[PDB]
Design a protein around this motif. Structure first.
Motif, mmCIF file in Angstrom:
data_model
loop_
_atom_site.group_PDB
_atom_site.id
_atom_site.type_symbol
_atom_site.label_atom_id
_atom_site.label_comp_id
_atom_site.label_asym_id
_atom_site.label_seq_id
_atom_site.Cartn_x
_atom_site.Cartn_y
_atom_site.Cartn_z
ATOM 1 N N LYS A 5 0.823 -1.203 0.000
ATOM 2 C CA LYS A 5 0.000 0.000 0.000
ATOM 3 C C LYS A 5 0.861 1.258 0.000
ATOM 4 O O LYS A 5 0.548 2.239 -0.675
ATOM 5 C CB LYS A 5 -0.941 0.006 1.208
ATOM 6 N N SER A 24 -8.114 7.266 -0.902
ATOM 7 C CA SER A 24 -8.760 6.541 0.184
ATOM 8 C C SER A 24 -8.022 5.237 0.452
ATOM 9 O O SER A 24 -7.279 4.750 -0.400
ATOM 10 C CB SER A 24 -10.227 6.254 -0.147
ATOM 11 N N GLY A 25 -8.229 4.677 1.640
ATOM 12 C CA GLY A 25 -7.585 3.435 2.020
ATOM 13 C C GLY A 25 -8.026 2.261 1.166
ATOM 14 O O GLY A 25 -7.228 1.381 0.844
ATOM 15 N N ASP A 26 -9.302 2.247 0.800
ATOM 16 C CA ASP A 26 -9.842 1.183 -0.037
ATOM 17 C C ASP A 26 -9.334 1.327 -1.466
ATOM 18 O O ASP A 26 -8.946 0.346 -2.102
ATOM 19 C CB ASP A 26 -11.369 1.208 -0.013
ATOM 20 N N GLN A 29 -5.813 0.198 -1.631
ATOM 21 C CA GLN A 29 -5.755 -1.252 -1.506
ATOM 22 C C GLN A 29 -6.252 -1.935 -2.780
ATOM 23 O O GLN A 29 -5.803 -3.030 -3.126
ATOM 24 C CB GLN A 29 -6.562 -1.717 -0.293
ATOM 25 N N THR B 75 -12.984 4.185 -4.384
ATOM 26 C CA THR B 75 -12.926 2.859 -4.984
ATOM 27 C C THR B 75 -13.562 2.781 -6.376
ATOM 28 O O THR B 75 -13.299 1.845 -7.131
ATOM 29 C CB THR B 75 -13.580 1.804 -4.061
ATOM 30 N N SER B 96 -13.127 -5.760 -4.954
ATOM 31 C CA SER B 96 -13.529 -4.532 -4.278
ATOM 32 C C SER B 96 -14.521 -4.815 -3.154
ATOM 33 O O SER B 96 -14.356 -4.330 -2.033
ATOM 34 C CB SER B 96 -14.131 -3.541 -5.276
ATOM 35 N N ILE B 99 -12.589 -6.438 -0.259
ATOM 36 C CA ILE B 99 -11.854 -5.478 0.555
ATOM 37 C C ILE B 99 -12.779 -4.700 1.487
ATOM 38 O O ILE B 99 -12.463 -4.490 2.657
ATOM 39 C CB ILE B 99 -11.083 -4.481 -0.332
ATOM 40 N N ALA B 100 -13.922 -4.279 0.957
ATOM 41 C CA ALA B 100 -14.866 -3.461 1.710
ATOM 42 C C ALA B 100 -15.296 -4.123 3.015
ATOM 43 O O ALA B 100 -15.224 -3.513 4.083
ATOM 44 C CB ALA B 100 -16.080 -3.138 0.856
ATOM 45 N N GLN B 101 -15.728 -5.360 2.883
ATOM 46 C CA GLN B 101 -16.142 -6.125 4.009
ATOM 47 C C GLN B 101 -15.139 -5.933 5.112
ATOM 48 O O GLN B 101 -15.324 -5.155 6.030
ATOM 49 C CB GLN B 101 -16.155 -7.587 3.617
ATOM 50 N N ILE B 102 -14.040 -6.648 4.999
ATOM 51 C CA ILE B 102 -13.039 -6.681 6.032
ATOM 52 C C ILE B 102 -12.439 -5.347 6.347
ATOM 53 O O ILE B 102 -12.254 -5.034 7.492
ATOM 54 C CB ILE B 102 -11.924 -7.580 5.570
ATOM 55 N N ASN B 103 -12.145 -4.560 5.334
ATOM 56 C CA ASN B 103 -11.493 -3.284 5.541
ATOM 57 C C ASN B 103 -12.241 -2.352 6.454
ATOM 58 O O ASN B 103 -11.769 -1.255 6.722
ATOM 59 C CB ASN B 103 -11.255 -2.586 4.213
#
Lengths: 74, 103, 106, 74, 98
Positions: A5, A24-26, A29, B75, B96, B99-103
């Motif tokens: 990251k 953003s962090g997402d 990632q 995202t 995507s 990632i959303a879930q856990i993040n």
């Protein structure tokens, strides 16, 4: 393997035009995954090209023949 | 100015080196999977390619964000980077939601 | 401002001037329509983006549309590829970059 | 000489996924101009390549050479 | 006879044919029949990409109707292109107003 990251974040902020731009962090990632897919696509297309030429390894010739399309698909 | 350039150059190389190390690893796996090697020059090319490609991604994300009024890249701009291919977009959207879930 | 479709006259012109025929050397002209590998004829000419690669390490003539960034990245990549095509031992790029690697970034 | 807005409008609608997507009259006028620029850009660049080879006519060989950098410019 | 698509392509093909004719006369160069067909295919496919991008660019700004901004985002990569599109918008704004 994969990108980190932090690294990916330094590669984006390296090119941003507006110093106020953030990620953003997402998003960051997600980019980590996107960059990984990009590298595999190139590497895999390289294999394909070389196999279609009955070659034994991927040299810069085969990678050249897949470049333009690879850049267009992104 | 002559130190600002040498600094900008060093940093660039630092980043190039990291991308190159990572690309080498990713290609190592592709070699094992498909059972075929890559010349050292092919790896180096893919690395430079990935490096320069990041610039395209960056400048696009920034504009896609500004297009939606946002200053923060989220995202769904990343998804706009993968529009060309349905399977690509599907794969990135699949990752995507994950990632959303856990993040 | 007229119709979206060709008129009688425009259609006749197209048929005899432009339309490709089965009796032509090239009956049809197609384009790649490409795929993502990692995620999963006769008289027909498939346009190639790779057969003139050795014309690609130099910026080509422009008419009204400047070359874009990704275009210049592409050209520069073709130049970098030309320079290491006949190597010739250890990679020039490897030595050029490896000394800047910081294990923290990886 | 160029593309009719009536055609361009149906050219775009052919590719929309959502049956609600519409095109502003002005954006449509811009898309009419854009398509022309692309065609003329390809044609002229093909010409410049036939000239460089001192050919008498632009063939697909001359077109394919300017193709990668053409598509990348768009 | 012709599918709605074929007639769209023939229309594009013919327009491309005429535009290449001008270029031929202006630049003093003949185009092969195949070259014009090729540019026609490029154009029709280029249009598919433009259309899909506009739709997504618009839906990205929560809009349902593609606008001028979406077209400018299309030409984001070329200074020449962007300059023209923006200028065109200006000429279009002048003609639209009055």
């Amino acid at each position: 393997s994969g990108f980190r990251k932090e690294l990916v974040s330094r590669l984006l902020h390296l090119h941003f035009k507006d110093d106020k731009t953030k990620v953003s962090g997402d998003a960051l990632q997600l980019m980590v995954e996107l960059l990984k897919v990009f590298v595999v696509e190139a590497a895999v297309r390289g294999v394909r090209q070389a196999q279609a030429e009955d070659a034994l390894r991927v040299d810069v010739d085969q990678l050249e023949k897949v470049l333009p399309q690879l850049l267009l698909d992104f | 100015a002559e130190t600002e350039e040498q600094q900008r150059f060093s940093y660039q190389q630092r980043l190039k080196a990291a991308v190159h190390y990572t690309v080498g690893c990713l290609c190592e796996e592709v070699a094992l999977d498909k059972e075929m090697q890559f010349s050292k020059q092919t790896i180096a090319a893919i690395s430079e390619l990935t490096f320069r490609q990041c610039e395209n991604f960056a400048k696009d994300l920034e504009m896609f964000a500004r297009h939606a009024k946002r200053t923060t890249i989220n995202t769904e701009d990343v998804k706009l980077l993968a529009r060309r291919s349905n399977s690509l977009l599907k794969y990135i959207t699949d990752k995507s939601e994950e990632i959303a879930q856990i993040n | 401002k007229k119709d979206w479709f060709l008129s009688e006259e425009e259609f006749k012109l197209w048929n005899r001037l432009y339309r490709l025929r089965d009796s032509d050397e090239i009956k049809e002209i197609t384009l790649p329509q490409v795929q993502f590998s990692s995620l999963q004829t006769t008289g027909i000419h498939q346009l190639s983006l790779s057969e003139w690669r050795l014309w690609q390490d130099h910026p080509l003539p422009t008419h009204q549309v400047d070359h874009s960034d990704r275009c210049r990245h592409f050209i520069g990549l073709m130049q970098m590829i030309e320079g290491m095509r006949h190597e010739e031992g250890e990679c020039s790029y490897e030595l050029e970059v490896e000394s800047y690697l910081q294990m923290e970034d990886v």
